[PDB]
Structure 1
Amino acid sequence: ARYLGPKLKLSRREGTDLFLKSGVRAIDTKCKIEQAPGQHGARKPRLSDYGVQLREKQKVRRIYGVLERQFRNYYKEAARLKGNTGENLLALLEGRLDNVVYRMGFGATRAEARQLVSHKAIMVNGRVVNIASYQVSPNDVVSIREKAKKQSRVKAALELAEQREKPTWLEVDAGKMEGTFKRKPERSDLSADINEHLIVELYSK
């Protein structure tokens, strides 16, 4: 269900630093970034309309490792909602459990985030969860269970998190790695640039 392939290859495909390989060493710098999609990166794309739409759709899915059919499930779920669908879908994607756990800082990469949920570590409302597709309910808390706490990794996992932008819609105890969920993530804060405008057009046909 996970891509689980070379996490920097997806980077060069879009050329964008999708923070897949964020880990310990802050910046990538060891792959000749931006100009190395595959074997023939010499050809600058004519890139048709469907391309910019697809390379936008993929780009978003690459940031969180979301599968197409599963992403489309998130899509109609965003459509039946009121307001601006382009904003409703992003909050749904941002509201992922592993996503919030990452945003709290419990891991340098989202890779560990999804992996952490699966191995009986993350505990919300005193209830251990293994489903990464868990839409986080409004105004809650998140934490790590004792018998899986700070196993030489968890502390260092929050190391890069110090130099992150550190979002607003959440906080953390950080003494036990106990995050705290607040309001839903607003559009203006998230995305930064990734055009959700293109995404809604794509699936509409």
Structure 2
Amino acid sequence: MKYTGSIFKRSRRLGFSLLENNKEFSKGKKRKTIPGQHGNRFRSSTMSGYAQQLQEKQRMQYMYGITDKQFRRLFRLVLKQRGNLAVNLFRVLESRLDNIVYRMGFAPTRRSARQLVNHGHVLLNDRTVDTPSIILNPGDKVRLKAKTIKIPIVKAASESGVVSPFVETNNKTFEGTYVRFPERSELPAGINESYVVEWYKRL
């Protein structure tokens, strides 16, 4: 599937909040564990490398929404260069166009960013794209086809949204550039290299 469908279910299972801090605190019944009825107490007897690798693969895959064929091919593209594959892979994961526009703060959710990018309303260097996973280069300028600036959802997203040092942006113009690579401390720390590069026994 291209998308997760429901999100809070996965985040309940992922144990991580894709949002800033909160996805649910009192929804009739709050839980910090797996959803469903079977989740009475099943998290303390499944400690295994296989389970950890699968869980973290789902965490980072659900964190951005990349299908397994695409997820594999993107890792191979990361293997293309040597660099430092750990930080290089993390920088590629955040370099997706939807993640780019999320970090400059014009979207409240990555699903909204994907939906907006797919409709062709986001113009990239005078040539728009329909693939919401574009890999960028430092110094890329964006603009959103200024008609779509009048959108109430975009307005409620972009008034005081995500402020980042590695990307320069202006909400008085809704435009910006990619200054530099983000630092690891500025990215979610619940994602590690070792388990998924191990589950990468393929390559």
The normalised TM-score by structure 1 is 0.87
CA positional deviation for 1:124: 2.0
Distance 1:33 1:104, change over 3 A: farther
Q: Which residue of 1 aligns with 2:2?
A: 2
- Cα deviations by residue, 1:76-118 (Å, 9 ceiling, x for unpaired): 1112211221221111111011110000000111111111111
Which of 188, 192, 195 lines up with 1:195 in the alignment?
Answer: 192
Matches within 5 A, 1:157-168: 157-159=157-159, 161=161, 164=162, 166-168=163-165
Matches within 5 A, 1:41-190: 41-45=39-43, 46-47=45-46, 48-159=48-159, 161=161, 164=162, 166-190=163-187
Distance 1:102 1:194, change over 3 A: same
Aligned CA RMSD, in angstroms, stands at 2.1
Taking the aligned partners of 2:2 and 2:137, their CA distance within structure 1 comes to: 24
Q: Secondary structure at the match of 2:98?
A: helix
Identity %: 41
Distance 1:26 1:42, change over 3 A: closer
Kindly provide the amino acid, as one letter, of the partner of residue 25 in structure 2.
T
Taking the aligned partners of 1:183 and 1:136, their CA distance within structure 2 comes to: 11
Does the Cα contact within 8 Å between 1:108 and 1:160 map onto a contact in 2? no
After alignment, is 122-131 or 102-111 more displaced?
A: 122-131
Which of 3, 23, 28 lines up with 2:24 in the alignment?
Answer: 28
Kindly provide the amino acid, as one letter, of the partner of residue 39 in structure 1.
Q
Does the Cα contact within 8 Å between 2:120 and 2:129 map onto a contact in 1? yes
Q: Secondary structure at the match of 2:150?
A: coil
- Cα deviations by residue, 1:164-192 (Å, 9 ceiling, x for unpaired): 4x222102121131132122334343233
- Cα deviations by residue, 1:17-56 (Å, 9 ceiling, x for unpaired): 122xx7xx96532441412433211132322210101101
Distance 1:136 1:30, change over 3 A: farther
The normalised TM-score by structure 2 is 0.87
CA positional deviation for 1:134: 0.8
Q: Secondary structure at the match of 2:168?
A: strand
